[PDB]
Every structure is written in structure tokens, then in C-alpha cells.
Amino acid sequence: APTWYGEPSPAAHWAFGGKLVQITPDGKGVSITNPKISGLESNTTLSEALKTKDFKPLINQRLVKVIDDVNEEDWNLLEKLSMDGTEEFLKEALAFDETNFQPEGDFSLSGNIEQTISKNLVSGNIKSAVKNSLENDLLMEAMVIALDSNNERLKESVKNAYFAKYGSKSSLSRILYSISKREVDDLVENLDVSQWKFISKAIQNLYPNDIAQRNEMLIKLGDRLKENGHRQDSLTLYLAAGSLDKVASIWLSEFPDLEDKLKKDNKTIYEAHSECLTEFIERFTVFSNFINGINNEQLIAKFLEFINLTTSTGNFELATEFLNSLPSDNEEVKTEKARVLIASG
Amino acid sequence: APTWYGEPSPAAHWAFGGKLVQITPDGKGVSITNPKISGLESNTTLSEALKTKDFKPLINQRLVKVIDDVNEEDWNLLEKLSMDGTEEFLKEALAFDQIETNFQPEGDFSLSGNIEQTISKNLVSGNIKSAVKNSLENDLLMEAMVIALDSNNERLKESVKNAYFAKYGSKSSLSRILYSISKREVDDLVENLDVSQWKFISKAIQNLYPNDIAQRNEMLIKLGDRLKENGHRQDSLTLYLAAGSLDKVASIWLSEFPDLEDKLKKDNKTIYEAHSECLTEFIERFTVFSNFINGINNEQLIAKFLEFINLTTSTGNFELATEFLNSLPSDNEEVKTEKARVLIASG
Amino acid sequence: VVIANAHNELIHDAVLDYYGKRLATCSSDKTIKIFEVEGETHKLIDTLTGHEGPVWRVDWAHPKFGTILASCSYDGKVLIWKEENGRWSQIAVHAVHSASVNSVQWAPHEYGPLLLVASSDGKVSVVEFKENGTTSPIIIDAHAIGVNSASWAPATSRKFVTGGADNLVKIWKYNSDAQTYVLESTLEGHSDWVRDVAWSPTVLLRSYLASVSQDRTCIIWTQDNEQGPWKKTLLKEEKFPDVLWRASWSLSGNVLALSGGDNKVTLWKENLEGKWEPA
Amino acid sequence: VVIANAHNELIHDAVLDYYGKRLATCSSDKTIKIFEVEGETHKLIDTLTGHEGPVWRVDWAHPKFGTILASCSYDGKVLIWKEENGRWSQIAVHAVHSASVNSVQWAPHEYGPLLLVASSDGKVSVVEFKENGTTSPIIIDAHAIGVNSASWAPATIGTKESRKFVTGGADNLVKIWKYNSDAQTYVLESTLEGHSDWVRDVAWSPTVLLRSYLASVSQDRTCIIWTQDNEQGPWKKTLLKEEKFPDVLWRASWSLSGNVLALSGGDNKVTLWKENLEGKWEPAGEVH
């Protein structure tokens, strides 16, 4: 028969930390537990690698179970960055693969040009010789005379004369023009992206004792690479400019498509979302562990997200770790910081 | 009737110094004079000139009745040399008769070829040394230059230069000139440059040996020889003068001597007349020039001075004669003997 | 972890608070008990007294209001409780229904300190606690025979689902030009009294509802979006052994905890197909 | 400059020395007198005694031999004088002739103190002075009637065969003699005919120019100028002028240089002559 009230029943409930509260069959006892949800498992590897700072296993895990081709590069980039170390990595990644004449016989000053310049010389007038030279297409000579004096302004009035009509008909001429005038702006902004490992050396070469500038330029290049098909490479430049923000931004934009390729792989909306945010977080953690680097909203936003998935695993310890790394300026960060505390404490 | 002995008579005899001796009319006295011989006078102008050191009068006398043109040019030279003075003559006889910078890099470009690509790798890699080598082993000359012209390395800064000479020096005169200057020499210009640009060589020699007067003169004399040997007699005298080489001018002049005395022979002059005038004029021109130069060892030269001495003593002018004998090496037992004779004869 | 004999009379509700560390029970003895569980230990902390009849349910409020607990009982009233300075005391009392109150639930902390109440008298009440303390609620006739449960929808515009003894499940939405919650949809699908209704807090596009009934079946109601209707989906093709009494969603993972009459608890999750299976 | 009254008797010869400074003279008073002339002043040094007759000529030896003078006289003797410390003394006597000696001339110095002697006996003697001081002469019959002059040719420019002198005789002939080793004496090279009366003097020019010049001077009032272009060639005859001279010509003397002839005649005058382009002779300085 049916009855209005008081029937016996477990009266089950879920609570923070993934705990299940129910009533014993005797109807007089309460039982709290942490059920085993196939598919959900506290992240040990992350907790253990984050402490022993040895992501060899973690990296070896993601690598052996990677998703799409691109993802594989990133973990490989991290697999090798793991062994060789940051410094040693950026090395292997930014490097590369007649005199005499004896005069003979009679000769003579033919022409006015020659005679005028010759007279100048002997008459110890090294300055005029060059003027008379330049005002004729005797640049080769003008240069030879100048390559003999000390006078800088003169020893330079010719360079600016060479470039004046050649730096535009020769790529090597335009490059010299830049090496000469101690600059990179030109290469960094117009030299073909394919020869980046070069524009790379022109930054470390011209700014060897001014890091702020060295990195402002390296960055300016990375952006250009990534925006012109050199994704893998722009990351290398960023890794050397210490701009985790750029790498973060790229990865946050690549997030969606990544969660989609996972959802098509026979996974529930949750398995996909779950798996995705985890891969991104482990990929970001290991990467931030080798570079020289939170103020990015979405990153924070998604950081908070991984927190909850972690608390739900009961692993309050790994949850706090990420809680710490977030700006204690954010209230959501504040609240969860407090909640995780009591929940565990 | 004729008689065997004791007949009166002037019983003359000539004697050293152009003196004539004869018994006087009364036959009891002796006369000793210095006869007048037409065309034979004591060279007073030379005596004066050599005493005063003013050859203006002698220069003009010789300039009024000069023989052949070369000689005229010679006395003409001497004239100007007597007014302007050695130094001022040499200055007037050796004397001679910004741009575009706008480059702005534009558009996208790129390195193409293994050459353009490797040099730049050397530049940024801060390996300027090797960048220069590659530019050279490849015919990228300006390139290597533009580069070295930014370094302050020498052994390199010159490797570029020697390359420039090695392939352009034989193809361009201007290039060749540059060679010698760059290498601080003038042998090439002194030896092979066109004898027409001598004023350039001369001037070049001066600018390389301002403190080495010996070298300078050795070069100026070398250049001097060429001009002479290449139909530039008047210019050779100029470079010789400036090098203070009275020897060379004595040779040019000693050699042109025989011909000179042959043209005077044809002027309807006797053997004595020819020899005499040629010698005196040879000696005058020389005594003069020898006064504005910087200086007697030549054997040929000595024999003529000794020939002039003899014509001198016969005009009676023992004084002038002594002047010349004193310019000869007292080591010549001829000059020695002669000195004695004159000495005893005059004093 | 087990806390045997928390009461001598049969227990009807046990809920952990925002931190899932502070337990609370209620039963026929007409009392509530506060516990503190750790590893596999426990310590009673108090015994709430006041209800004149067996206590049916309790709901912990969001910490941002203080340490409160709400309860309802066959006595047809609702009592709020507080733990200020280290001791629990009946702050307010809500009693506008004329029959057993069977469920009570604190709205999302964004709405403020609101309480959702359902009673066998067929009505549902919405209660806030004024600036001064007293209460000026919303009372609506929501089911014939009697209302057994009511749950709040997550926050965005405010909605809640009720489950009556008229076998119906019902969604409610607040309306301005009425100053009351109006009936948005009626979902038919049970052939016997609906015992409980739970609106999942999942933040995915799709909304999930789970109703449990005297008919020995659980139904998961889902709505793709505003233009979609509520689609019915039996938890499993075969009926269950006994009456399903409760439904509870985890806070993450959208995992459903079903409490049967055979005093057995089954766990479920959704799969690629959109059909449930044991999690 | 004049030196009046050198002697009371007539003077026959007056010669200056190698320097043209010391003057010797001789007269019919049988004496020689050495003088020292300076500017327009002079001073008698000594008076040489010994000749027993008129003294005809005197010649000054080259300086390298010290201060020596030779003289000859109507007495047929030749006396050599020397001056050691302002003091003159007879230092040797050459007396091998049987008649008057009319000329004495010292040879070019290269040959040593060699003296050429001409006598009216028709002979000519060549005399030097051995180490000790004495002499070993060469004597040759050179002209019939008498010899009045003998003069040396310039020294070739030390082969003793190239020595030549020229004589002048009262047989009208002008002869040329050359030394010969085999014969050990001077032998006849050539007789130059062209005078009609006694040759009075012969002088051989020192001109060091291709041609050789001789000058004869005769009682016939003429002066021949003999020339020779070839060593073994013939000697050309050329009258100093086409017409005879007012009176007899007694001496002829060349200059040291320029080859200017100086003639002395009976009109007691002296004329100077030089050679012209035509190869003929003309006054050498303002004619009178």
C-alpha cells in the first residue's frame, strides 16, 4: 500500500569534494563516502611532478597519448626541452646548419678625371681626392682612398654614397646598410620570415647588453613568424624573450578547435571538456616551468575551472597549489581559497 | 855689305803670361810688355762677376750674341735664374697649371643564393673577419670594402686593398697610381709613368721624402735622366738643379761640347778662334750655373778648366787664373805645378 | 566513514554543508543533529529542538549569509537555524501552509537568502528575510493533492521545478507583470506521485532535470535551449524494484545519485547516445 | 816696363825665365847680367864674367833643374851658370867648337838638362850633364859655311827616337834632324830649300794642334813658314808675306799658346803674325 509520509530511504546527497552522504539501511546511521567514478581520477602525476618538478613521466604520458599532430609537437618541444634544459635548447634551436700585383711597363694618366684625382693624392690632399672621385663613378677608388685615412666623416661620406645607389639593387647591400648603421628595424620588419634565424642573430648581436630591447625585438619577430606560418618557430623566439603571455594567448585561441577534435573522438560533452582543460593545464604548467615568466583574464577564468574539477576529485592539495598561483586579488580566487581551506582543514 | 856678327836687332822672345821681351832701339836697354792681340782680351766681366757674385752683366753679354738655340735657352734659363733666384725658380717650374646620400629601405626583400646568405651569416654572427674573405673569394669587391671600411682592423683592412690592386691596377692608370701611394712608394711613377706628367712625379717625390733629402735627390735625378733621354733637355736641367746635381749638368754640357765647337768652326773661325770661344763660353755658362746650384772630380771637366787656365794666363790675368786653379783638386800634380808657376809669376 | 545511531527514531535527511565537512540530520524524533566528520571519526555538536512533528528535510545555506540551516516538518512549518558565537538558535519561523512541508531549499547565493518551500497543501512558497527580520513571501497554488519537492534552477530569469502528487512535474519562472512565479511548462510522464525533483547545476547549454516517482521510474528531462521543449528520457527501460524517493546531482560531472526504496543507491552518468548508464 | 842701360855695349839677347820673371841679358862687353823684374821696377842681381868675346845668346833651363842659364859667345865656348842662394857661379864649360857658337837652347824638360848648340864651324853639339857634372857630347857636321840656329821640336805627346830639332845655316838651308838609336846620334830627316841667303834663325812652334810649324828667317829678307801634316810627309813652304821685308830678319819666336809668331828685323822693328782661315799669315795685333 502507498503512504503519505515517513517511508525509509537512503536520501542520498552529493557534497563538495565529491562526497556522497546517505542513510544506513538500519535507518539510524549516516554514511559519507567518496564514490569511484570511472573516468574521474585525482591527478597524481601532476601533483607528484609539480612537487618533484620532474615532468619526465607526465610528459611521457601526454606524448604517448597525444591527440592531433600539432599537439604532438608541443609535447615533443617539451619532451626535449625536458632533457636538454632551457638554455641548451635555445642554442641548438637558434644556431645554423688574392694579393700581390706587380706593376710593369709604361703607362700614363689618361683623361682629366684621373689626372685631377692623382694630383690631389700626392699633394697630400686626401680629402679632395674622394670628392673628385664620388663626383664621378669612381666609387671603388673613392672607397680605396678612404680605407686609408682616419678621418671618420670622410671615411663615412662614401658608405652613405655606396648605399645611396646600391642598397636597393642588392639584398646583401640592404643588410650591410643595417649592420653598418647599427639597426635591425629593417630586417625585423621586411627581411623574409624564412631567414628568421638570421634576424634572430641580428638582435642578439646589436643588443647584447640591453635585454629589455633584445626582448622587445625578439617578440616583434615572434608575432611576425606566428602570423606568417611559422608557429613552431615563433614559440622558440617567445621562449627566449620570456613572454609566457604570447604563448598563453596562442594556446587559448587554439583551445576551441582542440576541444572539438576531442568531442568527435567519441567522448561526451564532459569527457571532451574535461580532457581538454587538463591537457592545456598540464601543457601550460610544464612550459611555464622552463621559461622566464597571471594577468590574462581567460587564462585565470580557465584556471578557476580546473580547480573545481580537481576539488571534485578530492585532491584538495593539487587544487590549492593552483589556487596559490592565481592573483589573490581575484574574489572568485579568494572565495575558493577559503572554501578549499575549510573543506580540507 | 852683309856681316857675320854683332848686328843690332830687337831679339824678341815671347814669355809666360803673354809677355814680349825685346832689346830697346838704343840697343842698351830691355823692354818687357804685354802686346795687344786682336780677339785676345783679359776676361774682365768674368773676373768682376766672380768677384762680385753678380752675373747679370755676364749673362746679358752672353745673351746678346748667343750661338745655337739650345744654348740660347740655356742662357735664357740662367737669366731667369739670376733674377728670381734658385728657390723661386724651382717653385715656379714645378708648380701645376657634398654629394648624394639618400637611402630608405622599402618593402619586403630576402637573401637569395648561397653567397648573399653566407656573408650576412658572418656579419650578424659578429664574424667580420670571415665575411670579408667570402666577399673576396667571390667577386664582391665593393662589398668587402664597405665592410672593412667599418672595421679598425689593419691586416684585414688591407687584404681588401691588395685585392683591388691585383685586378684593377693593370687595367686602370688611376688604379696604378693609387697602388704606389697606398704602398708609400714612387719607384713605379719615377720609372714608368709618362715622362709628360713629370711634374706629378716630382711633386710626388717631394711628398714622400720631405725629411730624406738624399732619397729625394736620388729620385729627382733618376726622373731627371729619363726626361733627358726622352727629349726633355730643359726639364732635365730643372730636376737636376732641384737635386743639386752639378755632375749631370756638366755631362749634358760636356757632351754637347764637340758639336758646339763645330758650328763655331763653320762660322768662318780659325782652329784657335773656334776652340777659344767655345771654351770660354763653356766656362762662363758653367761658372754661372755653378753659382745657383748646391755643389771638381770629373776628369774631362778638369782638363778643360786647365785649358781655360792656359788661355787665361796668356791674357795676363794671373788673378782670374788663380781663382780657377783653386777650384781644382790640389791633388793633381798638374794643378799643383800650375799653381806654382802662376804664384811665382804673379806674386 | 559511518556514524551509526545518530538518532533512535528513523532518519529522513542528512546533508553536508558548503564545505562538505559539517553534517546535519533530521528524523521522527522531531529533532536535528549537527555533526563534524573527519577521517573515520565524528563528534555530535548539538541537537536542534522545536518541531512539533517528524522533520522531513534540511538545507544548508550559502556561507556568505552566515552558518544557517533550514528545516521543514509534518508540522507544516519551516524553521531556520543559526550558529552565532558557537551556539545554534531558532532565528525565524515560516508557516503559511496548512499541511506537511516536505521540502525546503536555499536559492542560489546570487538571489540572496531566499527559501523554496513545497507542501502537501498543494502550495509552494518563496521566502526572503527582510531588512528587519520578518517575512513577506510569495504563495502559489502549484499542484493538486500535494507538492512533495521543489528545486531551484541554476542562476542565469529565475526558475524552479516542482513535483506534485498529481503525477506532474512543473517548471516555474518569475514574472514582473505578475510579481509572482508563473507556470512555464507542465511535464507529463509519471503514472504515480512524484516524490522528488532535482534541477542539475550543470552549466552546459542543455538543462537537466531528474524527477523520481512512486511508479518506480526515474525520468531525466532535458531542454536544449529556450526554443526546445522538455524531452522525456527514462533513466532505464525496465522499472526499478521499489519506489524511487530522491534524486541528487553532483556539483560537477553532472552525475545523478538515485535513492531507492530497496534502500539502495545507484549512480548514473550520460553517454554519447544521450542515454544513462552506471557511473 | 823698361830697364835702361843694362850694359854700355850693345845687347844681343834678353830672355825671361820659365815664370817670365827673371831676366838674363848678354852684350858685346862679354858679360851676362841677371835681373829680377817685378812691376815697373827691376833690380840687378849679378853680372856673369868669363866669356872672352861677345856673348850672342842665352837660354833659361827648366825650373825643375833649379836656376840655371846657358850662354854662348864669339869665343866658341858655352858656359853653364847656376844660382845657389842669391849667388851665381860658373858651373860647367862646353868648349868643343873651332869657331863662334851662335845659339844655345835647353831641350824640352822631359829629356833632362839637354842643351842644343849651333856653331859657325858648321857643327851642332847636343850636351847633357852626367851624374857627377861633366859631359859626353854628340857632335855632327850640319851645314857648310856655318850654323846660326838650332831649336828643338816639342816633346812627343819617353822614346828617345822621337826627338827632333831644326837647324839653320849660312848655306841657306833649313835642315831637320832626328835621333837614331842604332847610329847613337842625330841624323838628317830633311833639307828644306827656300831661302837664297844665310838662314839666321829657326824656331819650332810648340803648338799642340795636328800641324807642326817651323819659321825660318833669312838675310834674304824673308820668313818661310814650314808646315807638315804627316809624320813622314814632306814639309810645305809658305812665305810669311809675298814681298821681301825692308831689311834682314834676325829672329823669330812663337808664343806659348795661340801660335802667334814674333819677328825681329834690321829696321829694328818687331811684327806679330797669326794664321787665318785661308791658311795664310796676317798681323796679330794692330799693324804699324
Side-chain angles (χ1 to χ4, degrees), chain B residues 34-276:
Chain B
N34 285 85
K36 68 307 155 184
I37 302 298
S38 41
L40 194 181
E41 8 177 300
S42 180
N43 197 317
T44 309
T45 300
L46 182 64
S47 289
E48 285 154 32
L50 209 44
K51 83 189 179 190
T52 64
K53 192 271 178 179
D54 179 3
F55 306 88
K56 301 269 188 173
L58 202 178
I59 302 299
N60 239 70
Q61 283 176 44
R62 272 297 162 179
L63 196 49
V64 170
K65 307 175 190 171
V66 57
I67 46 177
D68 73 298
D69 306 292
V70 179
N71 195 53
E72 187 184 310
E73 300 186 63
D74 280 344
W75 284 101
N76 275 304
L77 163 58
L78 296 185
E79 166 166 48
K80 295 184 178 180
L81 197 63
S82 180
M83 302 183 82
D84 314 337
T86 172
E87 188 183 304
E88 278 311 310
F89 169 81
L90 291 177
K91 273 177 187 170
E92 177 172 49
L94 300 188
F96 299 71
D97 316 291
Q98 185 55 70
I99 195 61
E100 306 297 64
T101 288
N102 68 297
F103 177 53
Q104 296 186 301
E106 275 280 74
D108 319 300
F109 62 116
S110 51
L111 301 175
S112 71
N114 315 177
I115 332 84
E116 278 215 315
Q117 290 186 304
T118 308
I119 286 82
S120 63
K121 284 178 190 172
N122 300 301
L123 299 189
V124 297
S125 182
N127 197 301
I128 305 302
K129 62 165 182 176
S130 285
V132 176
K133 196 189 70 177
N134 297 311
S135 289
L136 293 190
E137 284 183 296
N138 183 297
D139 278 67
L140 283 166
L141 215 53
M142 299 196 92
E143 335 294 17
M145 295 179 78
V146 171
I147 292 175
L149 192 54
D150 248 18
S151 77
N152 294 305
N153 174 297
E154 168 185 53
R155 287 199 165 187
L156 171 158
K157 193 180 180 188
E158 179 159 56
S159 188
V160 185
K161 294 202 307 177
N162 303 304
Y164 169 85
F165 299 137
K167 89 174 188 183
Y168 283 131
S170 65
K171 304 169 186 161
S172 178
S173 282
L174 178 55
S175 208
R176 190 172 176 174
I177 256 71
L178 291 181
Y179 171 68
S180 281
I181 293 180
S182 183
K183 196 186 180 195
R184 303 175 195 180
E185 301 195 68
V186 281
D187 290 280
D188 192 52
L189 286 66
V190 168
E191 194 176 59
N192 313 315
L193 191 57
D194 189 351
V195 151
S196 308
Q197 191 59 278
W198 66 281
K199 284 190 186 183
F200 179 64
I201 311 171
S202 156
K203 180 62 176 175
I205 304 175
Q206 291 301 313
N207 265 66
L208 179 63
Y209 301 115
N211 300 155
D212 200 333
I213 192 63
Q215 192 86 299
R216 176 196 320 176
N217 281 15
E218 175 168 45
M219 289 299 88
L220 291 159
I221 291 178
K222 214 154 166 290
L223 181 54
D225 290 340
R226 277 184 74 203
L227 303 190
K228 177 49 171 60
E229 206 141 68
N230 273 272
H232 273 78
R233 183 177 185 292
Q234 242 44 49
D235 292 309
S236 60
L237 299 184
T238 306
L239 285 177
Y240 286 144
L241 178 57
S245 186
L246 193 71
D247 288 307
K248 296 279 176 177
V249 184
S251 293
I252 303 295
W253 291 354
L254 270 165
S255 61
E256 313 175 314
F257 191 79
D259 313 315
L260 226 32
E261 168 164 27
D262 270 43
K263 304 176 191 172
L264 289 178
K265 177 66 201 196
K266 299 170 186 175
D267 190 279
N268 293 304
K269 298 183 176 175
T270 53
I271 284 301
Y272 176 94
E273 276 166 54
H275 155 71
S276 209

Side-chain angles (χ1 to χ4, degrees), chain A residues 3-7 9-12 14 19 21 23 25 27-32 38 266 268-270 309 339 342-343, chain C residues 1 3 5-8 10-11 16 18-20 23 25 56 120 193 195 245-246 248-250 255 257 259-260 263 279:
Chain A
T3 58
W4 288 119
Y5 326 89
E7 213 60 45
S9 152
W14 288 102
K19 302 158 195 167
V21 178
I23 287 178
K28 308 184 185 183
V30 175
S31 167
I32 297 78
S38 53
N266 312 304
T268 57
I269 296 299
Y270 181 83
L309 293 191
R339 174 178 199 171
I342 294 80
Chain C
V1 190
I3 291 62
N5 294 292
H7 281 293
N8 282 295
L10 178 60
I11 319 176
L16 289 177
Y18 186 60
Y19 315 78
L23 186 66
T25 58
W56 300 139
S120 292
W193 306 347
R195 286 299 183 174
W245 296 91
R246 289 291 190 59
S248 165
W249 293 107
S250 39
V255 179
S259 297
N263 215 88

Side-chain angles (χ1 to χ4, degrees), chain D residues 106-120:
Chain D
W106 291 105
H109 65 278
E110 298 84 347
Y111 308 178
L114 201 39
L115 192 76
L116 184 62
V117 178
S119 170
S120 289

Side-chain angles (χ1 to χ4, degrees), chain A residues 183-193 196 199-200 203-204 207 211-228 230 233-243 246, chain B residues 108:
Chain A
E183 307 175 65
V184 296
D185 295 283
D186 179 52
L187 299 60
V188 172
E189 187 63 58
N190 311 293
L191 183 57
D192 197 288
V193 170
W196 67 276
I199 303 177
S200 190
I203 299 310
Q204 296 286 303
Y207 295 126
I211 172 66
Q213 195 63 299
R214 170 191 312 121
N215 282 13
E216 183 204 57
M217 290 296 93
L218 275 178
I219 293 291
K220 198 156 177 283
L221 181 60
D223 292 315
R224 210 183 156 212
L225 290 189
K226 170 55 173 52
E227 196 175 66
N228 291 304
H230 288 68
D233 290 321
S234 74
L235 293 187
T236 299
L237 291 181
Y238 289 147
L239 170 60
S243 185
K246 293 289 184 177
Chain B
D108 319 300

Side-chain angles (χ1 to χ4, degrees), chain C residues 1-276:
Chain C
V1 190
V2 180
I3 291 62
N5 294 292
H7 281 293
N8 282 295
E9 294 282 290
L10 178 60
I11 319 176
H12 312 299
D13 215 25
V15 180
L16 289 177
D17 68 1
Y18 186 60
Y19 315 78
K21 186 186 167 304
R22 172 172 291 181
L23 186 66
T25 58
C26 71
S27 66
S28 300
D29 69 45
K30 312 175 186 172
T31 80
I32 317 295
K33 288 186 186 306
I34 317 306
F35 288 60
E36 297 301 320
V37 187
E38 309 311 312
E40 294 225 311
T41 77
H42 69 257
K43 179 190 179 198
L44 184 51
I45 303 305
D46 221 312
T47 287
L48 312 189
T49 276
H51 277 309
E52 325 190 309
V55 169
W56 300 139
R57 304 225 203 181
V58 288
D59 190 50
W60 290 97
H62 182 301
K64 83 174 209 178
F65 297 90
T67 288
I68 292 65
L69 184 85
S71 68
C72 56
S73 161
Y74 175 72
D75 72 294
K77 305 173 177 179
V78 172
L79 297 175
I80 309 86
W81 304 68
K82 199 159 183 178
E83 183 192 65
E84 206 171 305
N85 294 300
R87 298 172 205 180
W88 300 84
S89 54
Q90 288 179 55
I91 37 190
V93 63
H94 186 57
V96 283
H97 305 302
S98 55
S100 168
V101 170
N102 312 262
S103 70
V104 75
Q105 192 184 57
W106 290 107
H109 70 270
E110 285 81 3
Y111 302 10
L114 269 180
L115 194 76
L116 180 60
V117 179
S119 173
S120 292
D121 71 306
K123 298 170 185 172
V124 166
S125 51
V126 191
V127 168
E128 174 171 58
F129 306 111
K130 290 189 175 181
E131 298 303 320
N132 59 76
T134 55
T135 54
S136 178
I138 302 296
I139 309 178
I140 72 170
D141 294 352
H143 289 287
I145 318 310
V147 185
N148 299 160
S149 175
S151 311
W152 290 98
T156 302
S157 52
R158 295 180 177 178
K159 293 180 169 185
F160 66 74
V161 65
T162 67
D166 47 357
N167 313 172
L168 309 164
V169 163
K170 289 170 182 178
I171 290 68
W172 303 80
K173 182 176 186 173
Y174 181 59
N175 163 295
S176 291
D177 297 56
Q179 288 276 63
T180 188
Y181 278 96
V182 278
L183 178 71
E184 188 178 62
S185 306
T186 299
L187 313 186
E188 284 192 54
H190 289 301
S191 31
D192 219 324
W193 306 347
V194 181
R195 286 299 183 174
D196 200 32
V197 293
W199 194 311
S200 171
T202 185
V203 190
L204 288 181
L205 322 169
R206 178 177 290 179
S207 298
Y208 293 79
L209 291 183
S211 54
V212 139
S213 176
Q214 188 82 38
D215 62 2
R216 298 173 292 125
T217 64
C218 164
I219 292 176
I220 285 63
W221 305 85
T222 57
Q223 175 169 64
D224 292 358
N225 50 240
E226 311 172 311
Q227 292 162 153
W230 290 95
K231 294 179 173 173
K232 176 186 162 172
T233 287
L234 278 160
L235 192 55
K236 73 176 188 184
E237 284 170 287
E238 305 93 310
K239 295 190 179 178
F240 274 96
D242 187 30
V243 175
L244 296 190
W245 296 91
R246 289 291 190 59
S248 165
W249 293 107
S250 39
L251 306 172
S252 162
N254 193 53
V255 179
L256 180 78
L258 211 65
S259 297
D262 57 359
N263 215 88
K264 190 70 177 187
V265 186
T266 51
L267 302 184
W268 321 72
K269 68 175 184 175
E270 183 179 49
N271 57 60
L272 264 163
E273 305 305 318
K275 284 156 182 171
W276 305 77

Side-chain angles (χ1 to χ4, degrees), chain B residues 3-5 7 10-14 16 19 21 23 25 27-32 36-38 268-269 272 341 344-345, chain D residues 1 3 5-6 8 10-11 13-14 16 18-21 56 120 198 200 253-254 260 262 264 268 277 284-286:
Chain B
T3 59
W4 300 114
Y5 334 90
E7 212 62 66
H13 298 275
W14 280 106
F16 181 67
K19 298 178 186 170
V21 186
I23 293 173
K28 300 168 185 179
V30 172
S31 166
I32 306 166
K36 68 307 155 184
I37 302 298
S38 41
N268 293 304
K269 298 183 176 175
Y272 176 94
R341 188 172 221 189
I344 299 190
Chain D
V1 185
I3 291 68
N5 287 300
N8 288 317
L10 169 60
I11 305 178
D13 200 33
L16 286 185
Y18 171 92
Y19 311 95
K21 205 161 165 290
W56 303 139
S120 289
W198 306 349
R200 284 290 194 164
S253 158
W254 300 105
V260 176
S264 298
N268 195 59
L277 276 166
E286 63 185 59

